[PDB]
Design a protein around this ligand. Structure first.
Ligand SMILES: N[C@@H](CCC(=O)N[C@@H](CS)C(=O)NCC(=O)O)C(=O)O
Ligand SMILES: [Fe+2]
Length: 294
């Protein structure tokens, strides 16, 4: 059997040289002042680092490496038809900084729930939405590099009921302060290439309309309300890539609220790959945010 998932997008989605990538991540993180430590969950983009790395630093700076010991990474599936969630078949996720080990105890528990399928190595390596969080996770945790594990989870095209079921499942881990949930998503993909041209002309320029649409969704997430987030998706069909991981996170949050826990979510940075001004333009939006639980 193969023990390691290769960093199959190193060199094309981020720098393949370990030292250079470490330096890039350090610069981005050094631009950010921590305000939401110790983050129990984060939302972070999964585009190429040239496009979204400085944005993603706003989420990853909120991780406290002396507290966090187990990092779940929930990323949407881009290439395979998947109606549930899937777990990796390997034991180690390689990165150019250092290699990350999967938490065997949690993987066994998750598998024993019976709600997960096993993703093949090819499916595992083909997807990028989890991989793009490995370098940043490795960088954020480096002061404790030998004392943490990861729990990779591929999230498919979940129904609403599956979002609720998986939220309930993951809530027991979300309530543990040693755990961190990384929820991978980009926001609005606007343009004819994405077959998405929603435009609110009360907002002015197209990029301002995109910013307004994205921030309506972001505010709804800050309301910790999965039903309202679902209604927002049904109303505008915003091209939020990781809407299913986000729905899982929101349902998990509502499970913890029904158990006495107090929580708050704040988005800390918003960016667009470019500023659309005409109908032939296209852009992708990135947003970084953090959930703290007391
Ligand atoms: N270099 C990689 C990544 C390129 C990239 O990051 N593109 C931007 C669009 S400007 C992006 O946001 N991709 C992820 C997405 O569309 O959600 C590739 O060739 O696909
Ligand atoms: Fe995407």
């Amino acid at each position: 059997r193969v023990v390691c998932r290769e960093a199959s997008h190193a060199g094309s989605w981020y720098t393949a040289s370990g030292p250079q990538l470490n330096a890039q991540l350090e610069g981005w993180l050094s631009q950010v002042q921590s305000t939401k430590r110790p983050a129990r969950a984060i939302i972070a983009p999964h585009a190429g680092y040239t496009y979204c790395g400085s944005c993603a630093a706003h989420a990853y700076k909120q991780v406290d490496p002396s507290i966090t010991r187990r990092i779940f990474i929930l990323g949407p599936s881009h290439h395979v038809p998947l109606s549930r969630c899937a777990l990796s078949s390997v034991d180690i996720y390689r990165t150019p900084l250092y290699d990350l080990r999967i938490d065997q105890k949690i993987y066994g528990e998750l598998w024993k729930t019976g709600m997960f399928e096993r993703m093949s190595l090819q499916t595992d390596e083909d997807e990028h939405s989890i991989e793009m969080h490995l370098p940043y996770t490795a960088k954020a945790m480096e002061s404790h590099k030998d004392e943490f594990t990861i729990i990779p989870v591929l999230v498919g095209a979940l129904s609403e009921s599956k979002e609720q079921e998986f939220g309930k499942l993951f809530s027991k881990y979300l309530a543990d302060p040693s755990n961190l949930f990384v929820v991978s998503s980009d926001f609005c993909h606007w343009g004819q290439r994405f077959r998405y041209s929603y435009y609110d002309e009360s907002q002015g320029e197209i990029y301002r309309s995109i910013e307004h649409l994205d921030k309506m969704g972001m505010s709804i997430i800050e309301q910790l309300d999965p039903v309202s987030f679902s209604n927002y998706l049904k109303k505008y069909h915003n091209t939020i890539c990781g809407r299913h991981p986000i729905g899982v996170l929101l349902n998990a949050i509502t499970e913890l609220q029904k158990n006495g826990m107090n929580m708050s979510f704040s988005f800390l940075n918003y960016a667009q790959s470019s500023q659309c001004r005409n109908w032939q333009d296209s852009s992708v939006s990135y947003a970084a945010g953090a959930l703290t639980v007391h």
